[PDB]
Homo-oligomer: A and B are copies of this chain.
Amino acid sequence: MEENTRQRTENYISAKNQHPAWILLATRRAPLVLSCLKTLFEKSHDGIPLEEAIQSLSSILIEHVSQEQYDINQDNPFLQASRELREWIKRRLIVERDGRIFATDALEVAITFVESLDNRFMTSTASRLSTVQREIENLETRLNETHQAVEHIRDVYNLASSLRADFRRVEDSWREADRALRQSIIGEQYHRGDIVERLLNDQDALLNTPEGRVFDSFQQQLRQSSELKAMSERLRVILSHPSASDALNRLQRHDLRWLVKRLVDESQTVLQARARSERDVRGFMKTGLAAEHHRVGHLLNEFLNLALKLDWQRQMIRKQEVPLPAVGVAVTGIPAIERLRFKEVDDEAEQTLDLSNHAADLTQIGDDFWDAFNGLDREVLIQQTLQLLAKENRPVGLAELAELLPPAHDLETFAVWIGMAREAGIEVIDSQREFAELSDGEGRRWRFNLPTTGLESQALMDIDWE
């Protein structure tokens, strides 16, 4: 199947980003950095001081500064080398620890490629030059199952299903943080710094718990898509196995197949669940308390803080009445006797039923209907053409055929015959005119003028007809 290609080309186009080594081999400065890293790591597996590598790479860079390729600048070798090695480090080509870089698998394969580049290409065609070169080579070195399937698949479903709860749990944390932040804002004691710093503390707070670690781990796995084709693809493979049908009910199987979509769309909830707090702080930077507004807001905050002490649960405790002033009093509803009236009607009657079985009267409409009902058929005439021409067994012209089967509804018959002539290959010619007569429903006689032709049963019965 060619489908594998449409996945293969995608794999390759992906790998030509994200994966460093293929990015490393592709950027001009690759030779230099490869040489430097190899020569450094060649003599130490347990780390190398960062500054030492910086110095080595800077020394190498300056020597080649004359080239226009590499865009090295004499003015600041140290910064350039440091920045280059730092950029490479940040792509997970090599992690840094204890002030020392360390080699990884990506660099390992990137090296494994280069050393195998046998420059013997562009074959010398066994020309004597090659023999001399190879003999010099030689001399030089001379001096030196079903029952398990349901349970396994159900376990996988249980695992995947579980994810869709941890995102809700993360939402819980962000909602709780928003609640606490608003609670503290109602407190009068915080600086601007307190508010704007507690949010960052929260952001770092939820990189600790297993749920938060799961989430932040996932988020990066959209940028470097890598796996998020693998998961869906392999799941498609598993669900392709027949026995899976027994393991899972149909709705499950549908849901699992689109796992990635539902996770992506579920994550939307959490981002908003964090948003609120991301918007609260801006609520405090702008409206710095001032003027009469400062002091009214201060009183409001005091009242709100004091209100917290109370037990707010009881409705009757709630129904306690406040000393607030009666302003905007509504005065209305005078209980005057004139306001009273009685129902002022006594009539009654049915919406008289009439279920008389009506029906249309077929005699009442005119010939615009009935003439249409008498539409001229162009099916029977087709049969009669063959019927007559088989008997005649010769080319017969339009005039003769019409005169033998004079039709009341006329023009369509001539049109049908002419078209059949084209379809069957019997040529018809405009030039040679010929004439015939017919009469209509009111006796009026029409003199048609037609093209010359003769129709043969052979071609017509040979050709097919829809």
Interface on A for B, CB 8 Å cutoff? Answer: 5, 9, 12, 14-15, 18-22, 60, 64, 92, 105-106, 109, 112-114, 116-125, 127-130, 132-133, 135-137, 139-140, 142-144, 149, 152-153, 156, 159-160, 163, 210, 213-214, 217-218, 220-221, 224, 226-227, 230-231, 234-235, 237-238, 241
Contacts and interface: CB of A to CB of B under 8 A. Distances in A.
B226 A119 contact: yes
**How many subunits of this chain does the assembly comprise?**
2
A133 B230 contact: yes
A143 B234 contact: no
Given A113-B109, A133-B230, A136-B234, A121 B20 contact: yes
Contacts of A142: 152
Nearest to A234: B140
A143 B241 contact: yes
Given A128-B214, A235-B136, A237-B140, A117 B19 contact: yes
A170 to B, nearest CB: 13
B92 A121 contact: yes
Contacts of A224: 121-122
Nearest to A153: B139
Contacts of A15: 114, 117, 119
Contact of A214 (B116, B117, B120, B127): B127
Given A122-B220, A230-B133, A213 B127 contact: yes
Contacts of A12: 114
Contacts of A237: 140, 143-144
Given A114-B15, A121-B106, A217-B124, A139 B238 contact: yes
Nearest to A5: B60
Contacts of A135: 156, 159
Contact of A143 (B117, B159, B238): B238
A117 B22 contact: yes
Contacts of A210: 128
Given A119-B15, A129-B221, A217-B124, A136 B231 contact: yes
Nearest to A125: B217
A109 B116 contact: yes
26 contacts: A9-B60, A14-B119, A15-B117, A20-B121, A21-B117, A22-B114, A92-B123, A105-B118, A109-B113, A112-B113, A113-B113, A124-B221, A125-B217, A128-B210, A129-B214, A132-B163, A133-B227, A136-B235, A136-B238, A137-B234, A139-B153, A139-B156, A140-B234, A140-B237, A142-B152, A143-B237
A159 B140 contact: no
Contacts of A130: 217
Contact of A19 (B119, B123, B129, B143): B119
A1 to B, nearest CB: 15
Given A19-B119, A132-B160, 6 more contacts: A9-B64, A112-B113, A122-B220, A124-B221, A129-B218, A132-B163
A159 B132 contact: yes
Nearest to A238: B140
Contacts of A5: 60
Choose among A105, A113, A135 the residue with the greatest number of B CB atoms under 10 Å from its CB. Answer: A113
Contacts of A18: 119, 121
A117 to B, nearest CB: 5
Contacts of A152: 139, 142
A263 to B, nearest CB: 10
Q: 3 tightest A-B contacts by CB?
A: A127-B217, A119-B226, A140-B234
Contacts of A114: 12, 15, 22
Nearest to A136: B234
Contacts of A160: 132
A231 B113 contact: no
A244 to B, nearest CB: 9
Contacts of A121: 18-20, 92, 105-106, 224, 226
A243 to B, nearest CB: 9
A89 to B, nearest CB: 13
A150 to B, nearest CB: 12
